[PDB]
Each structure stands twice: as C-alpha cells, then as structure tokens.
Enzyme design. Structure first.
Site, PDB file in Angstrom:
ATOM      1  N   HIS A  43     -16.386  23.629  -4.543  1.00 14.94           N
ATOM      2  CA  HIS A  43     -17.827  23.505  -4.720  1.00 14.94           C
ATOM      3  C   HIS A  43     -18.218  22.033  -4.723  1.00 14.94           C
ATOM      4  CE1 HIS A  43     -18.612  22.691  -9.269  1.00 14.94           C
ATOM      5  NE2 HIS A  43     -17.397  22.266  -8.959  1.00 14.94           N
ATOM      6  N   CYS A  97     -18.822  16.836 -10.384  1.00 18.80           N
ATOM      7  CA  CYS A  97     -17.761  17.583 -11.042  1.00 18.80           C
ATOM      8  C   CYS A  97     -16.463  16.823 -10.841  1.00 18.80           C
ATOM      9  CB  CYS A  97     -17.630  18.993 -10.438  1.00 18.80           C
ATOM     10  SG  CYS A  97     -16.335  20.045 -11.163  1.00 18.80           S
ATOM     11  N   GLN A 115     -19.089  30.817 -14.686  1.00 25.53           N
ATOM     12  CA  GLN A 115     -20.467  31.176 -15.019  1.00 25.53           C
ATOM     13  C   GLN A 115     -20.982  32.211 -14.028  1.00 25.53           C
ATOM     14  OE1 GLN A 115     -23.152  28.021 -16.590  1.00 25.53           O
ATOM     15  NE2 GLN A 115     -21.666  26.559 -15.780  1.00 25.53           N
ATOM     16  N   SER A 138     -24.825  24.423 -15.348  1.00 28.50           N
ATOM     17  CA  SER A 138     -24.307  23.084 -15.087  1.00 28.50           C
ATOM     18  C   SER A 138     -25.163  22.319 -14.092  1.00 28.50           C
ATOM     19  CB  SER A 138     -22.862  23.123 -14.568  1.00 28.50           C
ATOM     20  OG  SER A 138     -22.103  24.158 -15.170  1.00 28.50           O
ATOM     21  N   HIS A 141     -25.106  24.222  -7.133  1.00 30.93           N
ATOM     22  CA  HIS A 141     -23.808  24.230  -6.456  1.00 30.93           C
ATOM     23  C   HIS A 141     -23.955  24.589  -4.985  1.00 30.93           C
ATOM     24  CE1 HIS A 141     -21.779  24.507 -10.485  1.00 30.93           C
ATOM     25  NE2 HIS A 141     -22.883  25.180 -10.775  1.00 30.93           N
TER      26      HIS A 141
HETATM   27  C1  LIG Z   1     -17.358  26.977 -11.544  1.00 38.49           C
HETATM   28  N1  LIG Z   1     -18.339  26.452 -12.470  1.00 38.49           N
HETATM   29  C2  LIG Z   1     -19.295  27.376 -13.044  1.00 38.49           C
HETATM   30  C3  LIG Z   1     -18.369  25.118 -12.777  1.00 38.49           C
HETATM   31  C4  LIG Z   1     -19.505  24.531 -13.367  1.00 38.49           C
HETATM   32  C5  LIG Z   1     -19.529  23.182 -13.667  1.00 38.49           C
HETATM   33  C6  LIG Z   1     -18.443  22.364 -13.396  1.00 38.49           C
HETATM   34  C7  LIG Z   1     -18.498  20.894 -13.736  1.00 38.49           C
HETATM   35  N2  LIG Z   1     -18.046  20.613 -15.104  1.00 38.49           N
HETATM   36  C8  LIG Z   1     -17.319  22.929 -12.810  1.00 38.49           C
HETATM   37  C9  LIG Z   1     -17.274  24.277 -12.497  1.00 38.49           C
END
Ligand SMILES: CN(C)c1ccc(CN)cc1
EC number: 5.2.1.8
Length: 147
Positions: A43, A97, A115, A138, A141
């Site tokens: 992602h 990320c 999530q 977060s 994406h």
């Molecule tokens: C897969 N997912 C929901 C996700 C969300 C935020 C981050 C960054 N900390 C990494 C993964």
C-alpha cells in the site's frame, strides 16, 4: 451479473459506460473479470491532519487536510495508471507508512487483522489489481494486491 461489488456507470465527460467497485473504489472501462484464506498486499498511505497518528517517517507533524491528502492520492493513481511511475517507486518515496522502506509491502494476512475498509478492499481486489482511494482511520490508501 458481475464480480463482488461492481456496478455499471456512465462517464460524465464521454458518455461511455465503465465499471465501478464500491469496495475497492477501483474504476475501469472493461467489464470486470469474474475467497482465499490470505492475501498479500502493498500500500501507499497518505496521512492527513485527522489521521489517528498525524506523524510519519516523512513528517514529524502531518498538517495537510483530508482533501489535500486525497488530491495527492489521486495524482499518484494517475501516474501509476499512465505508466509514468511505478507503484513501488511512489510507495518508497511518498508513503506515510514505515512499509515505504519495503516498497509498501505489508506481507500476507488473514481477515481480522487489518482495519476493516482496508481488509475489505484487499480481499475484493484480484491478484495484481490495484484499488482506488481507500479511507481508514490511518489516512487514505492505494492498495496493490500482490498475492
Ligand atoms: C493495513 N493498515 C490498515 C495499515 C494502516 C496504517 C499503517 C501505517 N501505520 C499501516 C497499515
């Protein structure tokens, strides 16, 4: 009629029909083709001032608005689809990320770990397919299902 979550739509600018997936936010001209225990995804995350944690390796304090984050996501999708840029290259450079260091790769996972909007999009993508903008707590994406 169509694979999970797809609908017909009509282009406002050209009038030609296209297809929209309301789980992945993907859109494409061609009629879509068509679940496993696990999928592997990469992602690219763009965070914004209302992210759960408005901080990343790129920026100690992330101040951009949700609307500004979506514009960035949209622009990355455009360059990935045109071939001007690779997904992996943009994830390494611009993802908010820590997985940016791994070209965005998050590894394989099952239902129940990610999530929910992210999990749903990941499992609705076909192998090799990429999502549209997916919203979580977060941030926003772009998801690439690799396995
Ligand atoms: C897969 N997912 C929901 C996700 C969300 C935020 C981050 C960054 N900390 C990494 C993964």
């Amino acid at each position: 009629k169509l694979p999970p979550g797809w609908e017909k739509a009509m282009s406002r600018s050209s009038g030609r029909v296209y297809y929209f997936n309301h789980i992945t936010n993907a859109s494409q001209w061609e009629r879509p083709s068509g679940e496993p225990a696990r999928v592997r995804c990469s992602h690219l995350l763009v965070k914004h001032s209302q992210s759960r944690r408005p901080s990343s390796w790129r920026q100690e304090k992330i101040t951009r608005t949700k609307e500004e984050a979506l514009e960035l996501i949209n622009g990355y999708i455009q360059k990935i689809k045109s071939g001007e840029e690779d997904f992996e290259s943009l994830a390494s450079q611009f993802s908010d990320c820590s997985s940016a260091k791994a070209r965005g790769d998050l590894g394989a996972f099952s239902r129940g770990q990610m999530q929910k909007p992210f999990e749903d999009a990941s499992f609705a993508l076909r192998t090799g397919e990429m999502s549209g903008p997916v919203f979580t707590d977060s941030g926003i994406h772009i998801i690439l299902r690799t396995e």
